[PDB]
Amino acid sequence: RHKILHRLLQ
Amino acid sequence: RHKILHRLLQ
Amino acid sequence: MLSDEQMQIINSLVEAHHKTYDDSYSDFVRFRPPVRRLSMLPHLADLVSYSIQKVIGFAKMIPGFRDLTAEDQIALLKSSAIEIIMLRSNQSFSLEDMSWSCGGPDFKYCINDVTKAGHTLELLEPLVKFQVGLKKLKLHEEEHVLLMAICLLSPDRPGVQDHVRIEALQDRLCDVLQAYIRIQHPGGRLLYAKMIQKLADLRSLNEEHSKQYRSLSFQPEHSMQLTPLVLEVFGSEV
Amino acid sequence: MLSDEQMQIINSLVEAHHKTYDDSYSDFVRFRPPVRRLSMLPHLADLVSYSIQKVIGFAKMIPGFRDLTAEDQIALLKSSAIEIIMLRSNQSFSLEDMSWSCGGPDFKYCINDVTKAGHTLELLEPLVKFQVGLKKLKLHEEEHVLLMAICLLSPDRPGVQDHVRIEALQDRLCDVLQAYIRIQHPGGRLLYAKMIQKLADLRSLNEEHSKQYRSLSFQPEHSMQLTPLVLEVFGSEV
Ligand SMILES: C=C1/C(=C\C=C2/CCC[C@@]3(C)[C@H]2CC[C@@H]3[C@@](C)(O)CCCC(C)C)C[C@@H](O)C[C@@H]1O
Ligand SMILES: C=C1/C(=C\C=C2/CCC[C@@]3(C)[C@H]2CC[C@@H]3[C@@](C)(O)CCCC(C)C)C[C@@H](O)C[C@@H]1O
């Protein structure tokens, strides 16, 4: 579920 | 479903 | 003449780009080294992964992007990432070499190097002609960054939900750009139209890249050389 | 005295290990360079990923492993991979430096370098004492490879189905090892017991590594620096 994208988007 | 492992195990 | 709101937008986008594009390219030494089958895939996988992080950072500083829902931010980045990378790479592209030159011979990428990452001329021919024509426009950095933001904030992407909000944001940036060219770019009478055509070219380049990325990702021997971020962004998950 | 079957097994395992452990370490230059937060995680992620591929290649040449079902082969590799890596790394470990020395100062890993990949002394203290005690056994390469195969073919791993088949295979290798020490290793009266204790130590090292890998993998900022193969092998999927 887009774990890296979510984190980088903060 | 362990796509890399399967391929490397041939 | 430009308003304080339009002008503030340009300031924000130029600073955002300066914060996320490092002209020294000193970080490139941290990538898996280039090797000149698919010998260049490790190095270019790291280059693209590093560039996705920069595009995420650029997007976060676009006025209004952060205010979108996380789902829309993801939808926009997944569809547009490869296009923004192709746009932003023009800054290292060189007409005399027909190559991307990133501060040193080890980080000079020619057409042949990219074939060594799995790509055929069906992608590399239009990609290089795209870089050439974009370089010939001799865009001001103000226009370069507006075009990246306009590309990013395109509402006609699969997965977008708040189409109306994103279209308004994109319309504002398009008006900034059209105005800027009118007042600040002499001889720019036909420039706005040519830049919009470049956005259409990117859609076709996106389509071809997705075909060839699909080939790579269906072979675990090669997909294992990618990075987690690349697999997530270029992946098909919803 | 050893039989032709036992002896053939030793031949197969030694050749398998020679084919999958390159004493020149020349491939290490292809990893993301070492940097001395978590500056060593990229380089050590690539080292481990490269090593997992070698352990897979070693396992495929163990007599009987290929004949297991794919599901059992995966179950064994996912549970044992980190243990085989810890075992096989003893060949580069050095008692005078208390470090792993891989043909050059850039590829010399001390305790401090490993802390720069997220690990605490709860793992590094037992790991280094394990390397020391294993190095003091001064194993013949025949014994070193038998111990890796015995570790790999352990039936008491989660997910294993054909427990009976894998136990028989492991019993055969244990008998080869015990015999070999009896006939070929002078002063090896207590060696078999000490090696089996090392297998128990590895279980505890495995447990501690899994805790600390769980920390790393739950933070996307760090898990994104791993490789697809590492995420798949050290991951919890079934
Ligand atoms: C990425 C950037 C730069 C170069 C970009 C290049 C040259 C090399 C080839 C590139 C990257 C091409 C853009 C897409 C293409 C590409 C089609 O093989 C990418 C495919 C990736 C692969 C893993 C499937 C350098 C600098 O300007 C920074 C900028 O962000
Ligand atoms: C991997 C090998 C070698 C060294 C291994 C080392 C030294 C460095 C630290 C290592 C790798 C440790 C074993 C586990 C540990 C480790 C606990 O941080 C690994 C954790 C990985 C991270 C991504 C979570 C060199 C050579 O003998 C080849 C052999 O296969």
Author numbering:
A (entry chain B1), B (entry chain B1): 686 to 695
C (entry chain A1), D (entry chain A1): 155 to 190, 251 to 452
From the paper:
The classical pathway of vitamin D3 (D3) activation involves two key steps: 25-hydroxylation to produce 25-hydroxyvitamin D3 [25(OH)D3], and 1α-hydroxylation by cytochrome CYP27B1 to produce the active 1α,25-dihydroxyvitamin D3 [1,25(OH)2D3]. This natural ligand of the vitamin D receptor (VDR) regulates expressions of various genes including that encoding catabolic CYP24A1 through the VDR. In addition, D3 can also be activated by a novel metabolic pathway initiated by CYP11A1 (P450scc) producing 20S-hydroxyvitamin D3 [20S(OH)D3] as the major product. Here we present the high resolution X-ray crystal structure of 1,20S(OH)2D3 in complex with the VDR, as well as further characterization of its biological activities.
